[PDB]
Symmetry: D2
Subunit: 309 residues, 4 copies
């Protein structure tokens, strides 16, 4: 039984670390477990508020953090001097608000950076390119609870063993298919799509090479849809549209973490004009377009962008 806590401590032993990142991850994972439990019994009772407190408190108490960015907080949270550590965490404590009442899969998203500037800790420490991620992942609260995690050496999948109360490694170093057979976007925005998105979607439904149309899936929780894309392959799209000209999804704590996971699994994640991880953030709640998945599907989307530009 390779537990996440035993896996992470072991990974930190081979790298001769001080144990600070390990302490941070353990704290994050503890918050995730409390969130999983609250989610499993939610209807028997706001959850946004609770999951946000849980994450902030656990992270700050780890003595590993200097700056936190949460979806739930207008401004960056600076860690009190007495608990100052070297890491910056951007997180979405509970994503998939739209699906809570209807019991669909929802999740938690996070990315961890090392503070590199010499200055006093500020929001600017949270404005690194995703290419500078130290660790990132997500939890999926679905038919079972799962964490996808990467620290730069590929993507590992862990599942909450409910009897044992701990995360157990179920898949090591997962790789996305080069090409899938599923496309995933909200086609309710079709009226507002750019020409590139329209053309790409048309190619999926009416291919010109005799292949079967792709199947469509859209849970409407990003973590569920991205996780499906990871394990089954294909493409997930939340592009710019007329109602959301800069996209809807948030760069720091939605797009960068999933982009990091998808790239680590051998996939691609793009704004349409450049890799998501290469976008230099200008503000903590900045939005970007997100198109991600199997490299050949994303590469085909990029061709549509290129001939329509």
């Amino acid at each position: 039984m390779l537990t996440l806590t035993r896996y992470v401590m072991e990974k930190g032993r081979q790298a001769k670390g001080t144990g600070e990142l390990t302490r941070l991850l353990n704290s994050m994972l503890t918050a995730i477990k409390a969130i999983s439990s609250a989610v499993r019994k939610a209807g028997l009772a706001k959850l946004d508020v609770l999951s946000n407190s849980l994450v902030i408190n656990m992270l700050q108490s780890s003595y590993s953090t200097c700056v936190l960015v949460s979806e739930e907080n207008k401004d960056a949270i600076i860690t009190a001097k007495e608990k100052r550590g070297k890491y910056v965490v951007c997180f979405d404590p509970l994503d998939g608000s739209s699906n809570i009442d209807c019991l669909a899969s929802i999740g938690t998203i996070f990315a961890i950076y090392r503070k590199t500037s010499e200055d006093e800790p500020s929001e600017k420490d949270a404005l690194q390119c995703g290419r500078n991620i130290v660790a990132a992942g997500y939890a999926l609260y679905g038919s079972a609870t799962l964490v996808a995690l990467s620290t730069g050496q590929g993507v590992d999948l862990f599942m909450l063993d409910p009897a044992l109360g701990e995360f157990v490694l179920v898949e090591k170093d997962v790789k996305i298919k080069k090409k899938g057979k599923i496309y995933s976007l909200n086609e309710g925005y079709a009226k507002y799509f750019d020409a590139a998105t329209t053309e790409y979607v048309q190619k999926k439904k009416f291919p010109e090479d005799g292949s079967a149309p792709y199947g469509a899936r859209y849970v409407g929780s990003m973590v569920a849809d991205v996780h499906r894309t990871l394990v089954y392959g294909g493409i997930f799209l939340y592009p710019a549209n007329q109602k959301s000209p800069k996209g809807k999804l948030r760069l720091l704590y939605e797009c960068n973490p999933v982009a990091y996971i998808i790239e680590q699994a051998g996939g691609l994640a793009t704004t349409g004009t450049q890799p998501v991880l290469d976008v230099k953030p200008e503000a903590i709640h900045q939005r970007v377009p997100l198109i991600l998945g199997s490299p050949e599907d994303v590469q085909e989307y990029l061709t549509c962008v290129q001939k329509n530009q």
Copy 2:
């Protein structure tokens, strides 16, 4: 704490029943709990086979059944003479095979009939119109575990309390909105749709009255998509198409139960030409088209069918 077992026994006390239906439901619910538990720890290990055995064994042992129809069994299962009861159960022991690996919501579906013929128990006892349902419902194994149940007096929702190990009533007599704002179908089959489906879908994305386009959602597990339709309103479609000319979804143990639930909640469920519950089944594994949800959305779909016929 109004538990499902206490709710069902109480419902049977006011109706002066022998307790046979109550015994049947309790058995079904016990199978559901075992399924929930196996689902929650699935990745840590086929599940179709297991959930099928669980349901068959629990139902047969209730002394309440004479005939069972399962998705997993070519032929109807006749209950051994010594355990013969008066009820017929059609069930899908685990639905949403496509979503198991990716951890999306999956479910169990069932409908219960009283055997009305005088003959020896046979498959023909399972070929009643859904309009003759005595009890029907589904379990949803999602971020939490839920059962929707009706015995003819509206739809009640129950949630598995994990600490207590029992189903607890969370919503009594639920009603679907008259009109929703979500449409749900696999648009990957667009190339194969009939004119009516094409036109309806076009109206959702490009309305002609100045209203916002509907949002699209499609989990790709029927129970998840139908449950969302129930609680948020809107429309779910699995119509006939060129690849599935009679539809894909199964009449006895997929469509009739959800149709029964949706109608009990004040919604509509149609094949496109008639109510699902009014279809006289000719074979236990018969397929039908399924269009269901908020009455005004379904009524609008039926208008598209009518002007394209």
Copy 3:
């Protein structure tokens, strides 16, 4: 998987009952499960008050009761006319107060009678001899959670399956050994014992026939000590002493239920002068001496009583 709910409903099907006792037992068992859960997480927070409310509410709501006697209530609780059923329940909702802080096994004890008088329901309906018990048992909240139950056809043991959230039959028709090798009493009261108890205890430690002395065990929760006596054999004693001249243990909701269980398993349960189940109660909180266990050990205790009288 023979669950308690399926076992009890089945037992009621063969006996052509109205289902009223079955509804009562299910309710009692639901309270037991809630108690088990509260007990498992007690230190992470009175419990007497909670467990009492749980039992009273569940029993009254079953529409099966007319009179309740609780250890926690000075007077008998008469069921409101609208929920009147035919049964009387005497219960100790949580026994083993002394062991809660130190985490030793604790339990719940109950006996069920049919009201036989024609009069208005009163405390007098709870003053039947234990010989008139319809059903009785206990729950043990120990290293695992167990229920011992009898309805007149021997003793069955059930264990809470934590994954499944239900009681499962683990042993059918259990029989106590004719003679054991363990004696169980608080020897701290030795100064206050009568001559009979003194002599019996001396015989256990200094036998005159060359046999090994009995081992001593005393958890100090009656349910734990009685359950051990049931499965390992031997003798449990809470006799009269100078500080408690009529004994300490309560007749209605401590002694009668365990006496009923022990007798059903082929054991004996005595006051020292007569079987516990044959004592005609005069008051709802009456105390009796309790000596119970393997028939040959109890029979040997009775010989000490006889030669010292």
Copy 4:
């Protein structure tokens, strides 16, 4: 929520450790959780064998150990060179065999030492006086699951939060009463006691100063009885007797750990002639007499030893 994993990592951050002890404790605690779960569902199925494997595998995999002593293994287990760490663990993976069938509290016991010799790792590294313990504690699998732990700075109590799946600090720096009112030993061995034990026990039942006799408690699992002694005060005795002239309890992995806990809480733990922690072990499965608890009660026992020597 101060979790054990967060508490232990934090305790290791202030002490600038390499994290090796922390990794060891986490591993031990993970084994404890698996044991708790197996114990909670034991009757629904040897456990000695399982719990032994769990502990050995978890400890060896921590890269923190060089030598293990288990009750279940004749010889010391030398850690393979590739996983060699600096610590020695003596453990009883599951104690209280006698109480498993009857569902009474049972436990796991452990003591951790730093290897101090320069030689190749051998059994001799496990023969340090308990006074050289680095960390020690026990788990109690009772009505709830608890760990008592000390690393030299007093005794902390943790409880398994079943919803959260982790140990949570419930009491910091616990102190035993100076004098209690409970004595705990198997009085079935009275025929075989030495004069000192006889006299001490007589004083508890027949005091000569007008005080009330002590109450007697004896669960017959050492961990349960010792834990009760810790939280309620009093005295626990397993002295030498004619059948067990050197005592029964094992020095390395039963007596030293509980002695360490009791001393850290301000109590005393003696063989009758010297502190348990000061005994120099000569063999890994050596037995000693054990008398422990509130200092004034133990001090009174020692006076009986002294006037009978």
